[PDB]
Amino acid sequence: ATVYLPPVPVSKVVSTDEYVARTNIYYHAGTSRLLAVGHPYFPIKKPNNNKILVPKVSGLQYRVFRIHLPDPNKFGFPDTSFYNPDTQRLVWACVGVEVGRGQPLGVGISGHPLLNKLDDTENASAYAANAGVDNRECISMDYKQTQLCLIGCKPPIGEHWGKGSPCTQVAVQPGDCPPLELINTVIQDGDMVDTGFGAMDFTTLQANKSEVPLDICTSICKYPDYIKMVSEPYGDSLFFYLRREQMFVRHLFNRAGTVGENVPDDLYIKGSGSTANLASSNYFPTPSGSMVTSDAQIFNKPYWLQRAQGHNNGICWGNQLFVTVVDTTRSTNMSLCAAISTSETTYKNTNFKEYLRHGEEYDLQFIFQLCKITLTADVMTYIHSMNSTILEDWNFGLQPPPGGTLEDTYRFVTSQAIACQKHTPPAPKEDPLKKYTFWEVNLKEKFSADLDQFPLGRKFLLQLGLKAKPKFTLGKRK
Amino acid sequence: GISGHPLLNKLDDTENASAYAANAGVDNRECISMDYKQTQLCLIGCKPPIGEHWGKGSPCTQVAVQPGDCPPLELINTVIQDGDMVDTGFGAMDFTTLQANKSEVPLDICTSICKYPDYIKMVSEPYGDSLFFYLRREQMFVRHLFNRAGTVGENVPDDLYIKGSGSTANLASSNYFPTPSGSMVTSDAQIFNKPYWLQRAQGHNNGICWGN
Amino acid sequence: PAPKEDPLKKYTFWEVNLKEKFSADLDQFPLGRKFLLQLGLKAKPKFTLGKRK
Amino acid sequence: PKVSGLQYRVFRIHLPDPNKFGFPDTSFYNPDTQRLVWACVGVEVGRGQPLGV
Amino acid sequence: QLFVTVVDTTRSTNMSLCAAISTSETTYKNTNFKEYLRHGEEYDLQFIFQLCK
């Protein structure tokens, strides 16, 4: 019979604020306008070297900020004189981010010189018996409008579809479509947004490497794997996310190639010549974005953070912040010409050398609340289980056991044994704050005792009741 | 404002496209006219306000960027002056020394600086007399993607696609520009014509004049 | 002795057995947490908010 | 197989009964007085993946 | 029982790839790089079940 336990110990994970107290102490911080001059179609490198001439910066790339903050006790204050570091320890909680944006109106864009095409199949401009050989066109498109922002304190893991091991169903073989097998890995700085064929590697999957633009063929495209991240009980990889995304089909195109794998062809009647032939089965929707309004933006507005997702309340673990932005709206495309030399009073294209640039601008402005963590043994237990490194940074130290017993054969000193043998851990670790390239944002010496005479500052005061001059009104009437 | 140039820089169609072409020939400009994107803003201040634009930046010798690749475009901030051109939908930049063809775009914007308001400096100002009131309604869309005429001077690594045959083994222009549009005018899109009681402002100045 | 039980399965379906995935946890599933936000009141919420645009 | 979102995706969910399952505590429950039945009071339909048509 | 019918065409990813017959051949014939398209379809179902009598 059943006859239920019901079942224990799970053990469930409790909120950090019931042994953490926020305090009225606040410091402010900011950045100074981050501005990048990129290129979006391909990376522009020096044509005698591997160092960039212009790095590849698109608005269709995740721009991933590894924010790093100093420990607030190793960046201690003389104004703490009511606090104890033997019973309590300090942690930043970032309680506000405002993201400055204000770059010229200008929309991100991509293209491909040899996009794989035969004919248009949203409506037939041809009827062909079989599809081409060596036919490709100069056609440009952006993927899709993506605006998102996420704030975490550990790195976020995104998904994409990898190249799979060969199965019965689908194998990595000519005549047979490769298997798509899911590889989850952390969002790199400059990793691409989707195409509209989703998140996948295209390096390996697209053998021909001429179906989609050069920039995304080289990149891996990711979509954030939100699902896995909120099934995290702790939810320290993120604790804030939102997105705004949409796409359009502006026309189906038909590839110049065709399938080599089976398509059933006893399921419709077969005439003569062309109607006894299959010729398209390799249609694809060409992705495009859409009409952009520039009065509605996630950005230019302050995000009041506290009781954040997971059982993280939005307190900084590691004193770290991980911020992933896409914003396509003000991600300028510059179109210009400079002549290499001018000696002509007539036009020729061979004189004036086209050049293009991309602008990527972001600004981060912050208000931080200083907070404390009240320490006892059970609370100590929960924290080492969460992440032992946090307790260590502060150092309350070890904690035996383990422990363990080795039995092996000795003299001593071995000689005879295994023998000998060393086990190196490794040592060295890859390090999970340099797991991947991240746009280092230093706010260690950009803190401020000044808390009101910021734009964020003025909004913070407006929040706690009104305060301050002027508000509003505004504007406004009639 | 209908504006256009008989000699707008256009190679090929690239929205849906209809042909291929490699690197550009000689003389590909066309008679094309355009409507500029929907932009309405207004700002009230009591000291001239700060614009941004991408100006002419670091030289060709302090980088490794060629003449024909242009001296870098570095954001050079300066006050908005009457008769200054606005943001064009290609970003807000100088176009005097930034178009050596100088007939890539409508006639008006083939010379002079283009600015966008540099809201970040004015509003983070701890006095806020550069402005203290603004509003805007703006949008833009792509009418059609087109490609510039003009030879590639940019670096396309060619070993990131597996080669075609002949024409498709050759490399096209990649000098894409979107053309903006701001079509569908409507009279429910006016930010004008409407009283804005400035009993208090929205700055850090409450609208109280200085210098009168 | 057959034909035949079952009359339910006489039609093609994505077969989902659910008879063994029954739990009681609500703070480990995000679905548990959103449920509490409606119900027990509880969650424990914000979440977060105010302001995220 | 054919997997498209223009096809009906019918999930056949087969469930037991609570009687055939757990009893925490027995204290007002007699198989005589009453019998127990599932009510699924919340569901999540997950569908976060990349875009296509 | 629970019968749930979902059709969703909005985010239902279709993916593009090809297998090469050889990358030495500089063509892009129907029997060279042989194009393909797949569809990857994700759903997830979560429950919470209140007991009744």
Nearest residue of A to residue C33, measured between CA atoms: A310
Give one DSSP letter per residue of A18-35, joined into a string.
TSEEEEEEEEEEE---EE
Decide if A459 touches B, using CB distance below 8 A: no
Q: DSSP for D2-33?
A: ---TTS-EEEEEE---GGGS--S--SS--TTT
Residues in C closer than 8 angstroms to D14, CB to CB, are 8, 15-19
Query: String of b and e for A422-452 (b: at least 16 CB within 10 Å)?
Result: eeeeeeeeeeeeeebebeebebeeebbeebe
Shortest alpha-carbon distance between residue C12 and chain D (Å): 8
E7/E11 Cα distance (integer angstroms): 11
CB pair distance less than 8 Å for B165 and E27: yes
A285 in contact with D, Cβ within 8 Å: yes
Q: Which tokens is A14 given?
A: 């409790």
Instruction: Scan residues 202-261 of A and list those with Cβ closer than 8 Å to B.
Output: 207-210, 214, 217-218, 250-251
Q: Looking at chain B, which residue has its C-alpha nearest residue E20?
A: B162
In angstroms, rounded to a whole number, what is the distance separating the alpha carbons of residues B131 and B203? 7
Asked if residue B52 lies in contact with residue B75, where contact means CB atoms within 8 angstroms, the answer is yes
**Residue holding tokens 């673990």?**
A317
The answer to whether residues A295 and B137 touch, using CB atoms and an 8 Å cutoff, is yes
Resolution attained, angstroms: 9.1
Q: Using alpha carbons, select from A107, A3, A14 the residue that is nearest to residue A58.
A: A107
CA A88/CA A373 separation, integer angstroms: 5
Experimental method: cryo-EM
The sign of the torsion formed by the CA atoms of A180, A182, A183, A187 equals positive
C47/D2 Cα distance (integer angstroms): 40
User: What residues 127-186 of chain B have any CB closer than 8 A to a CB of chain E?
Assistant: 162-165, 168-169
Contacts of B162 in chain E (CB under 8 A): 20, 23, 26, 33
Task: Name which of D24, B178, E6 is nearest A140 in CA terms.
Answer: B178
Q: Check CB contact under 8 Å for A207 and E18.
A: yes
Give which of A125, A185, A282 is closest to E19, Cα–Cα.
Answer: A282
Q: Is A459 on the interface with C (CB under 8 A)?
A: no
- The long-range contacts involving A49-56, CB below 8 angstroms and separated by at least 24 positions, are A53/B63, A53/B64, A53/B65, A53/B155, A54/A357, A54/B65, A56/A190, A56/A215
Tokens standing for B139? Answer: 């949008």
Q: Closest Cα of chain D to E38: distance in Å?
A: 9
* Distance separating alpha carbons of residues B153 and B159, to the nearest angstrom: 17
